[PDB]
Scaffold this active site. Sequence first.
Site, PDB file in Angstrom:
ATOM      1  N   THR A  21      46.879 100.041  98.668  1.00  0.00           N
ATOM      2  CA  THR A  21      45.527 100.086  97.990  1.00  0.00           C
ATOM      3  C   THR A  21      44.556 101.026  98.210  1.00  0.00           C
ATOM      4  O   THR A  21      44.209 100.932  99.399  1.00  0.00           O
ATOM      5  CB  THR A  21      44.951  98.739  97.750  1.00  0.00           C
TER       6      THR A  21
HETATM    7  C1  LIG Z   1      47.502  98.706  98.706  1.00  0.00           C
HETATM    8  C2  LIG Z   1      48.819  98.706  97.980  1.00  0.00           C
HETATM    9  C3  LIG Z   1      47.893  98.281 100.138  1.00  0.00           C
HETATM   10  O1  LIG Z   1      49.173  98.087 100.381  1.00  0.00           O
HETATM   11  C4  LIG Z   1      46.524  97.391  98.186  1.00  0.00           C
HETATM   12  O2  LIG Z   1      46.018  96.741  99.165  1.00  0.00           O
HETATM   13  C5  LIG Z   1      47.420  96.208  97.287  1.00  0.00           C
HETATM   14  C6  LIG Z   1      46.166  95.421  96.811  1.00  0.00           C
HETATM   15  C7  LIG Z   1      46.579  94.457  95.856  1.00  0.00           C
HETATM   16  C8  LIG Z   1      45.599  93.569  95.345  1.00  0.00           C
HETATM   17  C9  LIG Z   1      45.819  92.904  94.575  1.00  0.00           C
HETATM   18  C10 LIG Z   1      46.983  92.527  93.819  1.00  0.00           C
HETATM   19  C11 LIG Z   1      47.846  93.597  94.191  1.00  0.00           C
HETATM   20  C12 LIG Z   1      47.765  94.314  95.168  1.00  0.00           C
HETATM   21  N1  LIG Z   1      47.998  95.338  98.337  1.00  0.00           N
HETATM   22  C13 LIG Z   1      49.218  94.825  98.170  1.00  0.00           C
HETATM   23  O3  LIG Z   1      50.065  95.447  97.278  1.00  0.00           O
HETATM   24  C14 LIG Z   1      49.817  93.978  99.084  1.00  0.00           C
HETATM   25  C15 LIG Z   1      50.106  94.722 100.476  1.00  0.00           C
HETATM   26  C16 LIG Z   1      50.507  93.957 101.687  1.00  0.00           C
HETATM   27  C17 LIG Z   1      51.722  93.716 101.975  1.00  0.00           C
HETATM   28  N2  LIG Z   1      51.889  92.836 102.641  1.00  0.00           N
HETATM   29  C18 LIG Z   1      50.834  92.549 103.234  1.00  0.00           C
HETATM   30  C19 LIG Z   1      50.263  91.697 104.164  1.00  0.00           C
HETATM   31  C20 LIG Z   1      49.021  91.723 104.513  1.00  0.00           C
HETATM   32  C21 LIG Z   1      48.208  92.384 103.817  1.00  0.00           C
HETATM   33  C22 LIG Z   1      48.592  93.081 102.958  1.00  0.00           C
HETATM   34  C23 LIG Z   1      49.935  93.201 102.760  1.00  0.00           C
HETATM   35  N3  LIG Z   1      51.040  93.514  98.804  1.00  0.00           N
HETATM   36  C24 LIG Z   1      51.312  92.363  98.266  1.00  0.00           C
HETATM   37  O4  LIG Z   1      50.263  91.471  98.405  1.00  0.00           O
HETATM   38  C25 LIG Z   1      52.721  92.109  98.062  1.00  0.00           C
HETATM   39  C26 LIG Z   1      53.208  91.368  99.364  1.00  0.00           C
HETATM   40  N4  LIG Z   1      53.172  91.211  96.911  1.00  0.00           N
HETATM   41  C27 LIG Z   1      53.406  91.578  95.743  1.00  0.00           C
HETATM   42  O5  LIG Z   1      53.369  92.557  95.592  1.00  0.00           O
HETATM   43  C28 LIG Z   1      53.916  90.464  94.803  1.00  0.00           C
HETATM   44  N5  LIG Z   1      53.253  90.349  93.622  1.00  0.00           N
HETATM   45  C29 LIG Z   1      52.573  91.654  92.982  1.00  0.00           C
HETATM   46  C30 LIG Z   1      51.794  91.273  91.724  1.00  0.00           C
HETATM   47  O6  LIG Z   1      52.625  90.797  90.819  1.00  0.00           O
HETATM   48  C31 LIG Z   1      53.226  89.684  91.334  1.00  0.00           C
HETATM   49  C32 LIG Z   1      53.897  89.889  92.801  1.00  0.00           C
END
Ligand SMILES: *[C@@](C)(CO)[C@](*)(O)[C@H](Cc1ccccc1)NC(=O)[C@H](Cc1c[nH]c2ccccc12)NC(=O)[C@@H](C)NC(=O)CN1CCOCC1
Lengths: 211, 231, 244, 235, 233, 222, 240, 195
Positions: free
Chosen positions: A1
């Site tokens: 993000t």
């Molecule tokens: C960038 C894409 C960084 O990768 C953003 O921070 C994004 C922020 C965000 C905030 C609110 C909602 C969705 C996304 N973060 C992520 O996409 C995040 C990145 C990530 C993955 N593993 C991590 C561990 C520690 C910190 C961040 C991490 N991804 C997720 O949270 C993934 C694991 N989950 C999903 O993508 C699942 N959900 C997405 C929305 O729909 C339902 C499923």
Amino acid sequence: TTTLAFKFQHGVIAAVDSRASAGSYISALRVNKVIEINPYLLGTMSGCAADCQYWERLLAKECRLYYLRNGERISVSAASKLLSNMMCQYRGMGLSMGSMICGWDKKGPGLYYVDEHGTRLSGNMFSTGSGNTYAYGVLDSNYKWDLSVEDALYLGKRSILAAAHRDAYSGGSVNLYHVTEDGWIYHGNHDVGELFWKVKEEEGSFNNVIG
Amino acid sequence: NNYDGDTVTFSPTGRLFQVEYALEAIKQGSVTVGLRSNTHAVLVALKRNADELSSYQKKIIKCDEHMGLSLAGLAPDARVLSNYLRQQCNYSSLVFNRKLAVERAGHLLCDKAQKNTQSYGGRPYGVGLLIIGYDKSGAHLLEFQPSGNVTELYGTAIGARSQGAKTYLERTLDTFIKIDGNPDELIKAGVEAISQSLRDESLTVDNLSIAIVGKDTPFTIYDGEAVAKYI
Amino acid sequence: GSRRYDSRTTIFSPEGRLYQVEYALESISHAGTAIGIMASDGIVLAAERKVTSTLLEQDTSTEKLYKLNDKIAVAVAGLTADAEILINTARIHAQNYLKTYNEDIPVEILVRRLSDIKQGYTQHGGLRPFGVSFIYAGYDDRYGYQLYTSNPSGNYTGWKAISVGANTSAAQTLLQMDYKDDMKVDDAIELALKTLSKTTDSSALTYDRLEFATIRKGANDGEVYQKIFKPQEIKDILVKTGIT
Amino acid sequence: DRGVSTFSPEGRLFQVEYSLEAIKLGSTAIGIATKEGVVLGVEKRATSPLLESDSIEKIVEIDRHIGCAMSGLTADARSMIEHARTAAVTHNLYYDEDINVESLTQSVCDLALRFGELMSRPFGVALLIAGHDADDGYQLFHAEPSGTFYRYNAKAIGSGSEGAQAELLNEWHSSLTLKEAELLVLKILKQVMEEKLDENNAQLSCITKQDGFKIYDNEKTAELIKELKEKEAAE
Amino acid sequence: TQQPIVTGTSVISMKYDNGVIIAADNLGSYGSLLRFNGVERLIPVGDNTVVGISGDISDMQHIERLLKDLVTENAYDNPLADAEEALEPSYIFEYLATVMYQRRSKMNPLWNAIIVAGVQSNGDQFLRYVNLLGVTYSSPTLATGFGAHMANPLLRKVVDRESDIPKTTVQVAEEAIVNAMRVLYYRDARSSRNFSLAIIDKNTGLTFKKNLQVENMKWDFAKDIKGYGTQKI
Amino acid sequence: QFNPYGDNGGTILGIAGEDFAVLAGDTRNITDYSINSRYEPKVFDCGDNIVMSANGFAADGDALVKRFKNSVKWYHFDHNDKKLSINSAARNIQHLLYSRRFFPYYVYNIIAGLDEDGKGAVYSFDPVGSYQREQCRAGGAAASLIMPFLDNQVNFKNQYEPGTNGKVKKPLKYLSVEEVIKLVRDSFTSATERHIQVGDGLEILIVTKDGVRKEFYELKRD
Amino acid sequence: GYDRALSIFSPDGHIFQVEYALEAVKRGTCAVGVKGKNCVVLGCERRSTLKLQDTRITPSKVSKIDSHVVLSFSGLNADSRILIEKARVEAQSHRLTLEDPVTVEYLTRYVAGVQQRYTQSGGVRPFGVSTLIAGFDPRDDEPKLYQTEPSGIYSSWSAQTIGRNSKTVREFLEKNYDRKEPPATVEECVKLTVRSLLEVVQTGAKNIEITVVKPDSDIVALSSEEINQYVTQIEQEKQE
Amino acid sequence: MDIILGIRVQDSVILASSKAVTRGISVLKDSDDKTRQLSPHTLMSFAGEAGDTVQFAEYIQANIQLYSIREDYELSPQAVSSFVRQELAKSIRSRRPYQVNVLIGGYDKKKNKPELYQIDYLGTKVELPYGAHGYSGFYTFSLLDHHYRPDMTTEEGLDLLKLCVQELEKRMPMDFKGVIVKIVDKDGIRQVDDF
Ligand SMILES: *[C@@](C)(CO)[C@](*)(O)[C@H](Cc1ccccc1)NC(=O)[C@H](Cc1c[nH]c2ccccc12)NC(=O)[C@@H](C)NC(=O)CN1CCOCC1
Ligand SMILES: [Mg+2]
């Protein structure tokens, strides 16, 4: 993000991307990284999607209860602090949450940065996430307090585009918000694919890219 | 007299007055009737209102797809006990993949009520319950008293003027037990039974409350125009 | 159950009084008189031991006057056993404050703490209150020399001169008559003993029926000394003031 | 003495029955439910003219779609309101929706009988809980310290209750407008109040689907009082 | 968290037209040491259920006691304990599965793999698996440990899908189970020749066979095998 | 050391139509290189016209579904037999998942049904409770194989109208239930070919205003 | 723990323990609160049965809860310390979690909540104290004056008195205090507060305490001589 | 955070604290005030782990402000420093210690003397004429050892402080974005807005 938010003459701008990752795999093309806490409060999201959603939706519960007891809207300063106090209870437990609390209250427009460490910073401009460095470059060189609403909306939009292009874990789409004293205003969902080509032609930028 | 200050005190004749006073609260409550055949079990309850502007207090509560009860006395105590039954029915399903036997449900209610009659500080429950249900051994009807006594019956009634309905069922015993595979006729017998406990007032559309459970019939409650058929 | 036997120690009367506090004060009114007098250059604490015996070991005895720290002392009126419970708590609070702030505890702060403990027994817990009234004599660098009193209600007040225990009505009248603001310690010593001599229920006031103490800046240069008088020293001050 | 959870020989809880006597001493509160909304009105009853009457808060917001009026020992109501507000917002957190008026009322009534030797006595206050939801529409509930709650088309609680309830018996019908209900509450309040009714010693409020729960201004109520006087003088 | 000490190997089972069959050897291993040779790992519950357990034996004995106590508790205040309200295979399984998953959630598992085989009130066949993780699944054939790798392939040749169950007789199913136990004795280093077999039929009830032996074994061809490549003598 | 988690394989797929929704999943259950069952249902009717599937670690998946079904039961008891809307179910499930934020249900969860306006709805969850409403979502082992295919064949991504050469997109015409089921079957047939944990059977649950209907199709058993 | 229900209902619907707590307030020394146009004044009686008192160190009747809010009381002195301590802790706790000081209305609501809690909690008796809480909200020039009592009810007052002979001074305030035109200056507000106490006090010497609170954390306590000048001027006008 | 300096001169205490706050590889803020007023004549600057610093500082502030209201009296700098030390010494053996180093600059109105206390996260207290935390002392103490007198004016203290910051800016690898300077004397606490 990539998220950003900045104060200016006519309130505060808030812009975010829409990508979600699961390692190299793009798990979501279009997620909502802004939460409408109330008609005058916004919350950006960066980090663990679950933590961002849970704690900011819990913040919204606590902000509504404030209104019922005191018969008055909560300040941005107080709202940001409640959130930072929550983070401090689960201090060291492994939460991952970076957020900006944007809004308009009696002191005028307000912007606070809060993260999982319990950090709480007041400021005119912030950007969080993997692609924040790219966004800062555009913001720092083009920001003024004397910006028009039209130009300010474009700046936040263009700053996310910059990050979406270079950062692999940023992109999908851009969500714009403009916070006024009559409340926040959604300014649409903008696909980066279409926006990139549009900006390239009109602005002349991204000369290095072939289109 | 001197021995009715709390539930932890026997009288000189071996009576528990606080329990007897709790039993008195049931007699003040509105009438409710229970009866069953071999295929179905029915609850019929006369609901009571505060005045003409008020609603008619609900008397019947669902506990599971195959079990429920009707109340007479303190309604909040029925809510506590029915909540306990819901949890016990639910524990049986989640842990043992097993629908809770009606007889075992009665044993659990008995034991819960008893603890309140032997300990200092607490009080007996101020409500009587009629539990109906359909399990692996067919249709069942139970009568619960807050003394702890639970009784399996073909038919019964509790509340004010309940003696009239109970006598009727005692005459009709041989007839209504044979009403198998006919839910409407079994309800008719229940509505005719509760009618023997009425004075001055009669059964209206928002006055009457009926519930039924059976072989291929989940526990369902009928109120409003759904009971106009039986008036 | 147990309710039957509960006296209910923490309730109001119809008149708005606390029964047990009032009855505890009645108990204290039969206790030996204790007097405190504050002067410009020090404080005096005088107190009468209750009908003693010739076989009582006086020089090792302590029923009235107790040391809380180097700067603060108390005179007791009421149940001695109850008073010792509170005294040990007060000694600990003073040391806690010293450990925390690296400064000696201000007199009022110590007094408030003890008074708050007494208050607690009148509002919750269902226990009887402490049948004790204190006179606190102390010094700190904020207010200088200070006299306080506390009673079983947990209420405390500051004084120039004050008495607790038996015959306080008579004792307070005598103190109010002869006390003046520019008074000194040696004069206050004389006033305290004269007041006890007139209010005592005994036939005559002697050394063996008294406990006495002073808090003086009469210590070499800017510092404060506590003096718990010995039996022979009480005998001398009785002759000096012309009572025996 | 005797237990707090003791039954009388008639089969009633002594303490619950005694708390009902405290509610009879309380200031009057009236509720009327219509198809256009529910109206809530209260007698403020200031003990002295120096008491700033606008600080008397006997009508209270629980949620945007639920309001509440009180009568009796009004200090006891604060923790009930706090629980109600928490329950309403917590359900919105768990289910992303408004909570049913009945479910909210049931949650408040669950506290009622949590007393013994939990709190040391029942509540000494009755509540009129008014609101709207999509399933059952406009609703008015009367929540007692017994743990019982009845739904009402119209209800009065407090010192002038039985006199007001008899009046509500005659006046209420299923086709009442919101304006008619407002005047009806004012009419009955004026009848049972000791002092003369005006905008400073009486308060109105309503709950509608569109605008939600609103407490009326003193200027707005004053006009409705003037409208009442004229229509009574009209015949 | 622990480690298994004394262990029991494969438990194998399958459905047939009128019921289920389950089998397990009588060995209690102590690592590579074949320490205990008289261990029963099939435990009947009433006359309609058999629980087959592999893994840690001390935990097996614990489960054996839970089941024995379950029968006792079911009979309490239950006039129909030997009829309509008797314990069913599905009741017994769900109880165990609840216990297994709770124990893993406390990070203190029962180090076992369990197969509950039986026949229900309505004559339906019951066959379900559960392990130390609380993982549950059902299939026409089920096997634990090595049996999963070697027995299932053989048993699935008989009942490959649900429609093959009515076509499979008890003689064919027992024959297949017994052959599978022989194959496991050839190839599982922690197995024994002695085993127990149980059949739960909807008509003939529970048949519990003890002290069975693997027979008709092929070893003669070993005499011709010499060296590891080039050796002729 | 004891590992409380496991991987039972499988793959699930949810697609939202204009007035319907589908939730599909393969029926194969596995550990490592072994097959536990060729038919072990993974998608469940939870009541109130809601279907649910928790894919990943079967034990945690069964526990979650069991708890949600229970949550529906108590929602009726506590709120006068009110129907649990799909949006309310989704929010409830977020809180069920976050209760174990520090010992998660190791599952990817999808639910499907109809919104309060009668339109098709699909909601997607991660193991710790982040959720979102989506038009299309594949979850589980072969999620990365299937999702791109759905971006192309459901949302017409990278597809333009001939003759314009990239200037005009393919318009987003709605899909029928018959068309969706074709895309579902082709998705699982393709996933079965290239993913070893996918196969044996395919079970689809279709949700309309009329209720919940089932359809079953065989898959390759290798 | 001691769980005994001390505050309970009686057949006539009264909680006697709460009502007897009001009798303790009736016994307490008189306290008065008057708010002007740009200030609030808190007056307090000191009973002159106690002389030989050290007025430097004796607990003052008016207590600061924060830099912008004050609290006076009537009733049991020991009980009042517990409420004041809790109030002071809550004031700092609010600043710490919300980053704004408490409003006077909020602080009152908290103290009243504490008093209420002690009327339906097991093993405790009600506070024998009624309080007057006064001050100015942060960045606000409107005066605030609230009253609380043992039952836990609270309300805002243009002017109010509590304690012994409060019936008499309330009588005085009701006829002397005009709402349309409140005491415009500090002088007029203090004068009216001293006048009201002179109806009850006895001697106007060391028996009257006055504390003036102005906006923006401007709180001061008047001295003996300053008050004595008001006492002198009032009686000289009265001789006519 | 990074650099916090302190110097006690004739009639005042001067605290200098960096303005930078960094998250990851990005400097989020360059105007951060790493200090809290504990009482009118007592100032505390702080540096350590993210979040813990402000939390601890605000917690101390609330406790001292509570004491001030209760007693209607300002605690001496020595008393406040001892309270702070105890809280840190209590903290170091906790489940999760607060990782905060502080300087406490105060003017004792009773003794009419400025006082500077240095306390690290372990609860190690020392009264000093000048002090620092972290690596700051490695660069600056040599200058202070050379130039410091106890009879220095406030203006001379500021000039010596400028020299210390200049040395830090030359030899430190990290950009700390300058310092906010505050003076504590008999008249209270004030900020030097141009530095
Ligand atoms: C960038 C894409 C960084 O990768 C953003 O921070 C994004 C922020 C965000 C905030 C609110 C909602 C969705 C996304 N973060 C992520 O996409 C995040 C990145 C990530 C993955 N593993 C991590 C561990 C520690 C910190 C961040 C991490 N991804 C997720 O949270 C993934 C694991 N989950 C999903 O993508 C699942 N959900 C997405 C929305 O729909 C339902 C499923
Ligand atoms: Mg495959």
